RNA sequence: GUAACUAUGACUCUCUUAAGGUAGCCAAAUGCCUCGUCAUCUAAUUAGUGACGCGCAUGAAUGGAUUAACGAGAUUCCCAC
RNA sequence: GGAUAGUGGCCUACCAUGGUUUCAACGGGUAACGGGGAAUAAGGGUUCGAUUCCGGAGAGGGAGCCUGAGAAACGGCUACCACAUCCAAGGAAGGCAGCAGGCGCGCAAAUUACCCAAUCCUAAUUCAGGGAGGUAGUGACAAUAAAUAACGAUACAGGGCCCAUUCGGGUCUUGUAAUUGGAAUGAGUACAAUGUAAAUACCUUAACGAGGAACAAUUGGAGGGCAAGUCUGGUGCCAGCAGCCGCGGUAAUUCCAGCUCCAAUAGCGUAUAUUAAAGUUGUUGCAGUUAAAAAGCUCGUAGUUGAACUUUGGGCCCGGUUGGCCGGUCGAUUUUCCAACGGGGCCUUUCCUUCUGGCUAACCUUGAGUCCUUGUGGCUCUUGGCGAACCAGGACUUUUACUUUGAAAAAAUUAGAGUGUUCAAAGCAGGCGUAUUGCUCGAAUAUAUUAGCAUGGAAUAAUAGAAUAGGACGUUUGGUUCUAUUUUGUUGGUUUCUAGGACCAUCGUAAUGAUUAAUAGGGACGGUCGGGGGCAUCAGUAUUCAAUUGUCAGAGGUGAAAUUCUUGGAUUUAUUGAAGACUAACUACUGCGAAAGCAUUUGCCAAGGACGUUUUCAUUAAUCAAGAACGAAAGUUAGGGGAUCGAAGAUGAUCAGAUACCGUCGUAGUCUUAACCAUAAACUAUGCCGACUAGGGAUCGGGUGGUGUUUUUUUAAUGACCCACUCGGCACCUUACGAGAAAUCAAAGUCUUUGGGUUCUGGGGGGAGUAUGGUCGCAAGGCUGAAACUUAAAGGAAUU
RNA sequence: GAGAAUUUGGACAAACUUGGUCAUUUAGAGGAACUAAAAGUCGUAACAAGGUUUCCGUAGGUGAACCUGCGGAAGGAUCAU
C-alpha cells in the first residue's frame, strides 16, 4: 500500500480478540470518561488521549471499556475541535513545508513533498465533505491554513 | 494478472473506443475507410478500366530473371491517368497496336507488381472489342 | 486494494490443489465465498471447511480430496439468461457430463443443472470441473 | 588540366607577395554586355515583382542578411475619384 | 398577443439569462436515405442493404401559390437561375429520377412489342380507362432438375476354385478388342388438341429424326502448395510462363507444340470488392525483457474498479411430475413397498401497513335437535364473532440495476410442421367417396436476446434512514387554522356537538430508546535509520600558475618519432602563496530517493520510508484522458567565474590521401546565480495496486536468549560491539516440478483447464518519426503525426 | 351590385451584385528532397577487438561514408579479488 510512495510497511496494532473489558481492570466507564474529558479540556486530541490512557492507566481500548469511541465522547460533551485530527495535522504539515519553501526556493524535494501533503489534504477534504463532517464550500488554498492552525 | 485491458461490466465505451482506434493499424480497414481506392488507384477503385495505347514498351525483367516484358503504356479514358499495362501471352504485342483501344484489368495482386515485371500493375484483356485470348488462339479476328 | 475476495479464495484453492496439498487457508472469507464452497462441497470437490471467527472478515481452512481439477471465478458478473446458459456450459466446461457453472440467481447461489430444474437465471460467479 | 558519364566534386600542381570571397545576397541605388534568361503582371511593359548567377567590378561594424513600426524619401500595380 | 386545423419561440412585443458538452456538444467526412433484411457460417462476429414490403424525400435548381377533404402537387400554375426548343423575328412552347427508346457517361444493364384475360385501382361507376399491372422478346445475374449413350453375341486376356498326376478340361467372373447385331430415347421437326385475351413456350401427341466422320463438351491445369508425365519435337537468360516459391543460359516433367493424364463439367476460368480462413483486431480471445510495442518519472480530475457484516435455523402437514413391485392388463395403460426433483400453509421473538362497507361459504358456537346396528355415523337450518371465498373504495409506500414469465411485436425472408409440383428449387396446394345432388384435412409452430408495458424472485451491486434527535408508536391528554353530510320543517347565518385533515404543548410506551476495526488506508506517537533535500560552514591532497632557492645540458611525448620549452639554467629539488574544480583510498552483488540523481566536515531548516504500537478516524481506496510538478548530458539567455580537461580551430605525425584514430596547444564550453529547454541504450530494453504457489547470506527496526567481550566508580545498573534463534520490510543472490520460439525466470509461474482491478502501447519491411496542420520554445527543437509509391521478406532465438 | 388593369404598404422569398470565411480540386519559373533501378565513380562506415568496441541523447566539424566533445547503455570483447 502506502498510497504516496512505493513503501509496503505492515506496521499496525492487532487489537485483542476480547470484546469485553480486561478482567484485571476496575474504576469503569464513569472515571475513565471523566479522565478523557478533563484531558480534552487541557487541549489534547483523541489520538493522544488513547495513548495517555494506554500508557499511564489500564485503559487498553476506550470503545471496549465504555461502548463509546474517544472523539464520539468529545462530540457527546461538545468538546470537539473545529476541523478533525486527520485534516488538522496534514494542514499543519503543508504549512510546515510551505513556510520553509519560500526561504529555501530550490528545495525541489520539499516542493515535491509539499504537492504530496497538499494532494492528500484535498482527498481527505472530498471525503469529509461527502460524509458532512466538514461543511460544503470548504477548500484549503494558501495563507488561510495560517488562520486554520492559528 | 489483469491482462492489461479493462474488465469492468460498465467498460463497453472503453472496450469499443479502443477497437475503433486500434482497427486503423489493419490494412484492409484503413484503405476501405479513407477511400484510398477513390483518390489514388488509376482505376478509381473499380474492377477494370478502358484506355487508348500511347506507346509499345520493352520493360527489362527484375534481376534473377532476364527478358523484355512487352508492356504497353496507355492513357485511361475514365480519368486521364497514363498507366503501363502488360500484354499477357507470347506474340500479342504484335496483336495490340499503337493508338488502339484496350480493356485493362489488375494483375491478380491488388495494386502490387506481378513477379519480375517492375512498375506494371495492369494487364490487357481486350483490344478494339475482341479479346487478347481469342485473337491469340486464332478464334476471332480484329474488326475492319 | 484487492478488487474481489472470491477471486483470490478460488485461486488459493487452485494453487494448493495444483501441488496436491490437503488443506488451504483463505484470509478474507465472505458469505459469497462460503456459499460457493458449499456448492463445491455438495458435488464433492471439497471435504469440510472451518470458519475461524476472528472479530473481522474472519478466515476459512478448507480440506481437499484431490478430485477438483479446475476451479475459477468469472470476475465481471455477466447478466446470464437461461436462454444462453448452454453457451456458457459449452465454453467453460469439459463437454457435457460433469462440471458446474455457478450462478448468483435470485433463488440463491446454484449450478446450471439446478437452475435448469428450477427454470430460473441470474448472473455468473464462476465454475468447478 | 585528367576522370563516372557526356559536361567533371576523385585524383594532380603552383599558389601575387599573406590569404585565396566563407555564411550570405544580387542585373540590387553595386551587371559593362543588357532591353541578361525563365516565370509573372498588360492586348502590347527598355518599367514592376519573384527566381536563376563564372557576380565587367556583391559580401561580412569600410559591416553582411533580415526586419515590425515610422517617412512631405525613390519606385510599381490595383480600387475610388 | 398574433397565427395555426390545432400544441409549441411557430411568429410578434415586453421581460429574465439561459440552454448543449470529454457519458464526445459543436464542427468536418460519408463513393450514408432508415428499416424488414443480405453474404459468410462452431460460438462470438465481420461486411453490406440504390433494388420486389414498410416508411422518408424529390420530380433540372431554389422559392411562391391557386384549386381542393387532401398538394406547398410539378404528366398544375407563376417568377428567377441553368440548359434548351419552333420562329414568318412580332411571338410561342419546355421539364422521361412513369413505359419503351436515343444520346452521353462509362468496367457495367433489355423491346420505340401485345393486352386489360388475371391482380387490383379510379369514376356518375357490372360495361369505360389504367406503359399500374400482366403477356411475349432480349437475357449463361443468380437458382432447380439433368442428355451427350445402353445392351448382348464373336476373339483375346486376366481373378476366386477339382487335383496345382506338365495336363488344364475354363465348368464362373473382371475386362480388353478400329471386331459386331438388334432393341431406346429426345435434341430437333410438325399435322393436331391443350395452353393463351390472342398468340409463343411448356404439358401430351400423328408422321419423320444415331451410328463414329457423329446429333462430336468444354474450361483450366500436370515442379511444389495441388489431383495429374522426370514422355517425344522446337526454342536456347531469348521468346515466354510464373497469384507465391520459381522455370528457360543446348538433353526445360514449368516456355510454344504433339501424345497421354488430371480437376470441375453445360459450365469453367479471369479481374476487383467482401466473408471465412484470421486468436493477422482478440468481449469470448491477441501481443508488448530480446521478434513491433511499458507511454522518463510522480501527482491528479473525468473514467473504470472498489474488503467484511444485517433471517441463519430447526422443524410441524398437504399436495404436481418421472423412474419406482409391476403389469395393477387388454403390442396401447396405474397401485403400493417405495424415492428424486421443484413448492404453499405453520411457529420457533418473525409479519404481507392495515380499514368502511359489500359476502362473509362459514363453527370459534347451538335454535328445536335428531331423521338413528349399541355410535361425536349426519344436517331442515341458523343469536353473540370469524373474514381471507370476497372486492372497491379508502391510503401511505427510502429508490434502481439484475433475472423469471406474459402481453403487442406487419408480411416477405429465416428455422420449421404437413402435402409425390413426375423429382427439386418451388407452390400453399390438395385429399377421398355415389366420384349424378358430393363430403373433407390444411394454409401450423418457433427466434426476433435493445427500449417501453405488466408480472414473480430479492442471491450480487450501489443509495439513504435515528447523532444539536426536527427519531418511531399510541384508549395519552391540550389550543390553532380548518372542511363538512345528516337532521335542525325552506335554503341562508352566530355559536354548537359530531367525524375527518395537518400544527406545535404535554403524557407515556421501547432493550423510558440509537451505528464491525479488513496481514485496506489516513493520521498521531516512540527510539531509530539513511552517500534523500536545501542553505550556510570545515577539510584534504592533487592540478595549473606565481615568488624565492639548488644544481649546468637536456626535458617532453611516443609503436617509432616530430611540433613543443631549454643554458637568459628548462625538466627535476625544496620553502611557500594563489585560484578554480574535485570529493580518491574506505567503496561493497552495500545505503537512500518518484525518476533524474546523491559519498569531505560541522550547524540549521524542513521532510521520508521501515519497524514498534491493547493509539486514533472509519472506506477516506486502486489506476488514471484532460491537467500538472520534477526531469542526466548537451544546448540557449544574461551576470560572476574561468584551475584542469576539451567540441570548433591551430599544428606535428601516420597515410596513397586521413582537414580522423596518436602528439602538442586550444576558443565555446557547462563548475556558479537567475531564466530556459524537456530529450537519453531516461533500461530491470520487464506499467502500477492486489492474492497464491519453493536455501543462504546482508541493510534497517523490533523480540528473546550467551554465566561472550568490554564494562569499575566496590560487586558493575547498564549501555555498545559481537554470537544463536525469531519475525516485519529492503536491496539481492544459489539451486529448481510450471511458463516460453528459445536465451532464459521470485516472476516472464497460477494461460485453449483461456476472466482479481486498472492505465499505456503494437499489427510485415521500407517510405518515416518524413510531409502537412496546430501546440509550446529566444533558438536549437519538443509534442501530436500521415499518405502516395515500393517490396517477399525484414527480424528474434538457438544449431552446424 | 358584380367587377378588370392600376397601385399603397406587409411578410414569404427566389435571383442579382459585392466582399468575406471554410472546404475540395488544381496551374506554377525555381528550390530542397525521398524511393527505385544495372551497380558506373570515390572511398570502406558497419558485421571478427571489422583493425578507433558498438550504440543512444545532444553540440560542432567534414567530399562521402563519417569524425570529435559531453553524458549515458551493454544489445561488450569483463557475470572475478
GROMACS .gro file of C-alpha atoms (C1' of nucleotides) in nm, chain C residues 1-5 7-8 11-12 15 18-19 21 27 30-32 55-57 59 69-70 73-77 79-82 87-88 91-92 104-109 114 117-119 121-123 127 129, chain E residues 42-44 283-284 305-310 312-313 341-343 401-405 449-450 456-461 516-520 621-622 689-694 749-757:
model
  102
  295UNK     CA    1  -0.687  -0.266  -0.280
  296UNK     CA    2  -0.799  -0.628  -0.360
  297UNK     CA    3  -1.096  -0.579  -0.603
  298UNK     CA    4  -1.256  -0.925  -0.530
  299UNK     CA    5  -1.231  -1.189  -0.248
  301UNK     CA    6  -1.115  -1.445  -0.693
  302UNK     CA    7  -0.813  -1.492  -0.455
  305UNK     CA    8  -0.707  -1.901  -0.690
  306UNK     CA    9  -0.555  -2.006  -0.348
  309UNK     CA   10  -0.267  -2.311  -0.637
  312UNK     CA   11  -0.207  -2.796  -0.824
  313UNK     CA   12   0.060  -2.924  -0.574
  315UNK     CA   13  -0.198  -3.030  -0.084
  321UNK     CA   14  -0.788  -1.497   0.466
  324UNK     CA   15  -1.709  -1.355   0.273
  325UNK     CA   16  -2.058  -1.520   0.286
  326UNK     CA   17  -2.038  -1.543  -0.102
  349UNK     CA   18  -1.357  -1.029   1.503
  350UNK     CA   19  -1.314  -0.912   1.138
  351UNK     CA   20  -1.395  -1.070   0.794
  353UNK     CA   21  -1.076  -1.680   0.771
  363UNK     CA   22  -0.902  -3.020  -1.129
  364UNK     CA   23  -1.020  -2.667  -1.229
  367UNK     CA   24  -1.416  -1.722  -1.100
  368UNK     CA   25  -1.563  -1.512  -1.388
  369UNK     CA   26  -1.463  -1.166  -1.250
  370UNK     CA   27  -1.722  -0.933  -1.415
  371UNK     CA   28  -2.055  -1.096  -1.307
  373UNK     CA   29  -2.601  -1.099  -1.658
  374UNK     CA   30  -2.674  -1.456  -1.789
  375UNK     CA   31  -3.023  -1.566  -1.918
  376UNK     CA   32  -3.145  -1.936  -1.915
  381UNK     CA   33  -2.337  -2.108  -2.448
  382UNK     CA   34  -2.153  -2.082  -2.106
  385UNK     CA   35  -1.745  -2.264  -2.346
  386UNK     CA   36  -1.632  -2.315  -1.977
  398UNK     CA   37  -2.581  -1.600  -0.818
  399UNK     CA   38  -2.957  -1.644  -0.901
  400UNK     CA   39  -3.238  -1.461  -0.705
  401UNK     CA   40  -3.344  -1.804  -0.562
  402UNK     CA   41  -2.975  -1.828  -0.442
  403UNK     CA   42  -2.620  -1.948  -0.538
  408UNK     CA   43  -3.011  -2.687  -1.055
  411UNK     CA   44  -3.458  -2.785  -1.294
  412UNK     CA   45  -3.594  -2.463  -1.123
  413UNK     CA   46  -3.623  -2.271  -1.460
  415UNK     CA   47  -3.136  -1.747  -1.402
  416UNK     CA   48  -2.927  -1.457  -1.261
  417UNK     CA   49  -2.556  -1.360  -1.302
  421UNK     CA   50  -1.719  -2.275  -1.229
  423UNK     CA   51  -1.499  -2.917  -1.317
  546A      C1'   52  -1.861  -2.354  -3.401
  547G      C1'   53  -1.975  -1.993  -3.063
  548G      C1'   54  -1.879  -1.472  -3.058
  787U      C1'   55  -1.569  -0.935  -2.548
  788U      C1'   56  -1.539  -1.475  -2.595
  809U      C1'   57  -1.294  -0.067  -1.031
  810G      C1'   58  -1.364  -0.095  -0.515
  811A      C1'   59  -1.291  -0.562   0.188
  812A      C1'   60  -1.632  -0.761   0.553
  813C      C1'   61  -2.125  -0.755   0.837
  814U      C1'   62  -2.792  -0.726   0.896
  816U      C1'   63  -2.940  -1.819   0.951
  817G      C1'   64  -3.207  -2.200   1.153
  845C      C1'   65  -3.684  -3.301  -0.830
  846G      C1'   66  -3.934  -2.835  -0.779
  847G      C1'   67  -4.348  -2.586  -0.368
  905A      C1'   68  -2.990  -0.234  -1.186
  906C      C1'   69  -3.031  -0.781  -1.237
  907U      C1'   70  -3.327  -1.225  -1.368
  908U      C1'   71  -3.834  -1.514  -1.441
  909U      C1'   72  -4.294  -1.532  -1.706
  953U      C1'   73  -3.160  -1.194  -2.670
  954U      C1'   74  -3.215  -0.334  -2.744
  960G      C1'   75  -4.270  -1.322  -0.963
  961G      C1'   76  -3.775  -1.354  -0.710
  962A      C1'   77  -3.492  -1.039  -0.377
  963A      C1'   78  -2.862  -1.408  -0.421
  964U      C1'   79  -2.472  -0.990  -0.650
  965A      C1'   80  -2.408  -0.435  -0.668
 1020U      C1'   81  -1.785  -0.443   1.262
 1021A      C1'   82  -1.184  -0.226   1.305
 1022A      C1'   83  -1.036  -0.561   0.694
 1023U      C1'   84  -0.180  -0.923   0.724
 1024A      C1'   85  -0.736  -0.184   0.308
 1125A      C1'   86  -0.928   0.350  -0.154
 1126A      C1'   87  -0.660   0.127  -0.677
 1193C      C1'   88  -0.229  -0.184  -0.681
 1194G      C1'   89  -0.351  -0.687  -0.509
 1195A      C1'   90  -0.357  -1.264  -0.382
 1196C      C1'   91  -0.127  -1.765  -0.404
 1197U      C1'   92   0.249  -2.110  -0.548
 1198A      C1'   93   0.993  -2.346  -0.301
 1253G      C1'   94   0.462  -1.906  -1.297
 1254U      C1'   95  -0.120  -1.963  -1.105
 1255C      C1'   96  -0.280  -1.903  -1.962
 1256U      C1'   97  -0.704  -2.318  -2.546
 1257U      C1'   98  -0.835  -2.645  -1.785
 1258U      C1'   99  -0.816  -1.927  -2.173
 1259G      C1'  100  -1.163  -1.365  -1.675
 1260G      C1'  101  -0.864  -1.001  -0.937
 1261G      C1'  102  -0.861  -0.430  -1.054
   0.00000   0.00000   0.00000
